[PDB]
Nucleic acid binder design. Sequence first.
RNA 1: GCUUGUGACGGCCCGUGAAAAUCCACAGGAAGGAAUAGUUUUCAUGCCAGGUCGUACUGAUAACCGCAGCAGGUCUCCAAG
RNA 2: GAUGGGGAAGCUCCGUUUCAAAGGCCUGAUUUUAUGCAGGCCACCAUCGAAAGGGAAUCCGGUUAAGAUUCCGGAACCUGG
Lengths: 135, 97, 112, 29, 246, 91, 77
Amino acid sequence: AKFLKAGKVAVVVRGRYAGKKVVIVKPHDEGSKSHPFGHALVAGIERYPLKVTKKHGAKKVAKRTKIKPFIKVVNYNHLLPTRYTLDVEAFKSVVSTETFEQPSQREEAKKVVKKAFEERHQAGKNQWFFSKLRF
Amino acid sequence: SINQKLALVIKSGKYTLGYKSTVKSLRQGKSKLIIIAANTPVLRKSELEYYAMLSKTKVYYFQGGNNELGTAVGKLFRVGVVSILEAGDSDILTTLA
Amino acid sequence: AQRVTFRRRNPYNTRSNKIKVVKTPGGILRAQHVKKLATRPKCGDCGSALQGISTLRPRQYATVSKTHKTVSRAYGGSRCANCVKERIIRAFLIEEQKIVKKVVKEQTEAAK
Amino acid sequence: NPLTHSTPKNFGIGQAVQPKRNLSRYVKW
Amino acid sequence: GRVIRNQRKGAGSIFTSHTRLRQGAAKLRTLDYAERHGYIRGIVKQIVHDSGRGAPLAKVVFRDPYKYRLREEIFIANEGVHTGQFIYAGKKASLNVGNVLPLGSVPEGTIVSNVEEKPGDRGALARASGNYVIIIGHNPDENKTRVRLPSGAKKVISSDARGVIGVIAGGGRVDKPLLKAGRAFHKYRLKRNSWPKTRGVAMNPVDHPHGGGNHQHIGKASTISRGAVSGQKAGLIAARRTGLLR
Amino acid sequence: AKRTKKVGITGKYGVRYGSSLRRQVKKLEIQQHARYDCSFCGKKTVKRGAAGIWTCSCCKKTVAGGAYTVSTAAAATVRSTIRRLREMVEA
Amino acid sequence: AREITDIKQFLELTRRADVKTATVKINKKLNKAGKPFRQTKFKVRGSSSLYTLVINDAGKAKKLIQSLPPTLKVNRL
RNA sequence: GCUUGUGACGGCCCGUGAAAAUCCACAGGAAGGAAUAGUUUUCAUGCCAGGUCGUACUGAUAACCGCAGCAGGUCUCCAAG
RNA sequence: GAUGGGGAAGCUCCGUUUCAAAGGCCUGAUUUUAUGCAGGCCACCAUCGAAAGGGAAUCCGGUUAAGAUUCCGGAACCUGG
């Protein structure tokens, strides 16, 4: 069956983001006026939170754990689909084709993504999706 | 043997050839089986298996190089992986594979 | 039918001493010393000249903006982007199968 | 607590550059 | 008299080795904890040509145990290695071509090369191309090992002495006629000044013991005592027999 | 158009060196300039760069080997003897 | 040894406070194929560079010359 | 067309045909810093200094060496119909 | 080719990182004062050796009885701050 879906984590293997982890939010399997190929809208995190430890108190923890996200159209061929998953229903509205085209709507739509990700990093659900891939 | 299995799929059933055209059938879950050469590079095979365990498809290993696997599907060129997306009157799916 | 000399005291044809023949504004042919050509930077993996970098001599990169010396992928000015595509595949699928190995070492305890 | 992770580093030869130990027995005096 | 030509190689002036293009001294890895209590893996980066030698070299890159870095070393490449190969080194390694094991760890009838005389000399025996020693037996108490040196001599060494599995690459080298004095000129420019060789017969009573006379001939036996003295020794030295074999 | 009859590749040497030596080289120089199958990429790109080293131009593997040919005679029976002693201890 | 295109950007460097002098060169050329015209250049001298503006349409070139700042000491032709 | 430069290919080797200073990129994440406002001299422009010894002329059928203003010897670039 | 060492009646010889306690950095700790004390580091450990090898950056026009890619006029560029 089709393992590219709304929750499926992937890895970005092609360009400026190569090595970073994403989540496939709104896949278009076949067709579009532009992008005449199967592509998937994704959201991912560009900066990974730094090592946090017992010894860091006070303000370091909040400034180590800062996440920087992104939203991108990407071609399947540039993704490694993997078995992991996220619960994506938070921002399903906020990451969309309508968000692109009006780039103001893209920096409005990182906030609802940046907030959903720093939540999950508390309450350590999806421990792996927040750890820097290494290569 | 396996040759008669592959050889009967040709005119009775539909299939794809080569790496990049299996993954499009495999990422679409149209792949009912894949046959993978013995000389194929490890990191290639490792990835073809990983796509399979996600799409839950049977991975059968042809015994031979890619020079022989194309001799099996009746091609004059080498082929390193083959995906069977619809089987013909042959028994390939129901049997050992 | 004009002929021209070296402009420097090296009489000899060595690798640094190359000459190009130039027509000046004052009508005369004159020789012009030329500096050795620049080689493209190479992928430290596959060896193929990695595109996007400007080809200069080594100390002429100290004078240049950083966009000439880099691309915006990870391992930008270093590996050829198909050597980065692999080592992402290889870093994910080696430490993928490496998790499956560590459950079997928990099972091989309870199975025996 | 949710954010902090457990590494453990594996000294089993073959991996994990060795820690700093007490070499006081081995030093060249 | 004069000082003859073989007495003239000792002071080593123009007779030294031509060392410029040589990749380095091909050795095995220093014997350490990780190798004698277990194995450590490198990979062979490129297998390359060394000047003055007959056999290719391989550069395998290990990971330093006690400090963060890489360390790369020069192995004489056994036949069958390829770039991208994992090369395992240590007591607990496996028997495959290119892996360096102690000799006690391999069964008799195993073919290894670049074996060590004593443990930790980083290789001695059978380093020329195509050579190998066979392991013909063990002595598990007062630990030794019985191996067959490439000449056919049988030597007995320690069982902690490492050696690398397989035959050294570059076999078949001397099968090809050299065919002209030029190709032998390009051979010894990368080695040393031995060439060409004037027959001591063809020189004067000063230049050699074989010199002089109104014909070319040696005049006395061409076999010399092992107990000869400096400069007397030219010709077949302390031979037990002589003449074509039958 | 076969041109020469006996000498083949050694026609470059002309009349010199004697017939045996020229014929004994023709044995090897047909081996070292020959083109071999590649045990990895599945094509035949393999050629010799130097004594001991055999370079694929496809998969860029370099492969150590025999001086005038890929696999030496006494080598192919080492990697069987080594394959046999390995199974001996693990079986 | 540089060139300026926009008129406005040229009006900046004249005030840039590194520019002590300028000049106006007049060159008589022809355009297209047939007929000539009067081409002028304005060369302002920086410390490290020399900027020039080329005016091929003489309807603009006069409105520009008057617009030069009074401190700048101009050498015409 | 000739001279020189260069690029992509091919041949040859039991011959595979220097080293280093020097400069840069990348991996890493030490730290340091937005909200009444804080950086960045690898973007632009602007500012100051750039020392010591060599520098003439022949380079040869008389300026070099051969007792000399010697038919000898002596490395090299440019090259018209 | 010094040093450390090692020979040599001695002039000096071996050797060049060698059986060596072979060294100065990066800033944190200081706002009594500047640098104590601080963790970490990095072990390559003289120097000499090419006016043809490697190498930061300059061009055109004019000028002298004799000098110029150096002087003049103009147009650039590099390096350290």
